[PDB]
Design a protein around this ligand. Sequence first.
Ligand SMILES: Cc1cc2nc3c(=O)[nH]c(=O)nc-3n(C[C@H](O)[C@H](O)[C@H](O)COP(=O)(O)O)c2cc1C
Ligand SMILES: Cc1cc(NC(=O)c2c(O)nn3ccccc23)c(C(C)C)cc1Oc1ccncc1
Ligand SMILES: O=C(O)c1cc(=O)[nH]c(=O)[nH]1
Length: 366
Amino acid sequence: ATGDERFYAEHLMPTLQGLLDPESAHRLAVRFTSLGLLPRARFQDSDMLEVRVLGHKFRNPVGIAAGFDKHGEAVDGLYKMGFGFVEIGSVTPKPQEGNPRPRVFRLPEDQAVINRYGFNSHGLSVVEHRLRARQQKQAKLTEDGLPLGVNLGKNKTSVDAAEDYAEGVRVLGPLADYLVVNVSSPNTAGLRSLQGKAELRRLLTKVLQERDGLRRVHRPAVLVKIAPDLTSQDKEDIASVVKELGIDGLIVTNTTVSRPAGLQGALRSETGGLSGKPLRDLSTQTIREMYALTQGRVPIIGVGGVSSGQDALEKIRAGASLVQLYTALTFWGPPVVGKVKRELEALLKEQGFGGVTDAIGADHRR
Ligand SMILES: Cc1cc2nc3c(=O)[nH]c(=O)nc-3n(C[C@H](O)[C@H](O)[C@H](O)COP(=O)(O)O)c2cc1C
Ligand SMILES: Cc1cc(NC(=O)c2c(O)nn3ccccc23)c(C(C)C)cc1Oc1ccncc1
Ligand SMILES: O=C(O)c1cc(=O)[nH]c(=O)[nH]1
């Protein structure tokens, strides 16, 4: 309800965030979500929100982005809050602790977060066993239109980046509906340089060879997640490699190392990736560019600063088939998920679209 949204947004979450620093709050949220405990959200998804892409049906196009459930501990609880799909990770091959604390910062006056977690990860083996313990349950959820994505990273000290990603394909590929090759974290030395043309072609050739070697019912789609901070040359190169190799999709975008003019939060000059509202339109414009460079033929998951139905529809009209959110959940709590879906349905009807599918890329056809 708007009453439930208001209680969370004006009383419960402001109070808890005043008592808990963001990393402690994040850990408590994941732990609590994993317990189930809470009933499924009220909103009932209508037919016009269904999307068929990446070889799967999505009951609604609003997902939880990577980095909230880094280790696969709260998947079922996230479906209960109404997300149409869940992405876990990033997961590294070996366990690692990430950067020293403090490493997460809130910018309440900007509705933004800065983080430098550094790929803290339980590692592939632990996550593999966690997902195996619910693998058949996930198979039924996927069949019912609730797919699962797994986001892969690399270890800090690894010498061969491509072998780190290949290991992730072999270990978690068989448990995923789609895999994400995350070459865009700002918080690992040298990672984003994997976005260049030659490095990217060789890396993605190896990743796709590994994927194709899996048995057919265990063969996921493969997407690449890119930064919002790329040059025009970088974007044309990514688009060329994606089409050359047959990559299945793109996730647009990760956090930004830029600091837009106008930020007010005291913590705006901390090192790390910036998320939330100051990222929104930079991400939407990157979606627009990548859709055009790929001729509308490559599915895009749009992410960055989504907290309303209007935010979601703007990314869909720019070229996204699905959207994700994270930072808005940390400020407004679970009710934001139903709010986005309710507003999106109303806007689709007001703008004369028969459903989400009809609106994908519509800005490009004006
Ligand atoms: C605290 C935090 C941790 C994140 N960790 C990851 C990660 O491990 N892997 C990844 O691909 N993206 C990660 N992200 C990026 C989000 O998936 C998303 O791309 C970005 O935050 C923009 O969406 P938002 O504005 O709705 O938060 C993280 C973001 C935040 C805020
Ligand atoms: C959904 C949610 C999230 C959060 N908090 C965070 O996840 C959080 C934060 O506050 N800052 N932050 C910065 C970077 C990354 C994450 C975060 C909290 C805190 C305030 C306790 C409560 C939540 O309510 C729930 C959870 C589970 N079941 C029902 C209701
Ligand atoms: O530090 C991380 O783990 C991290 C942060 C972020 O914003 N994006 C990402 O891919 N990783």
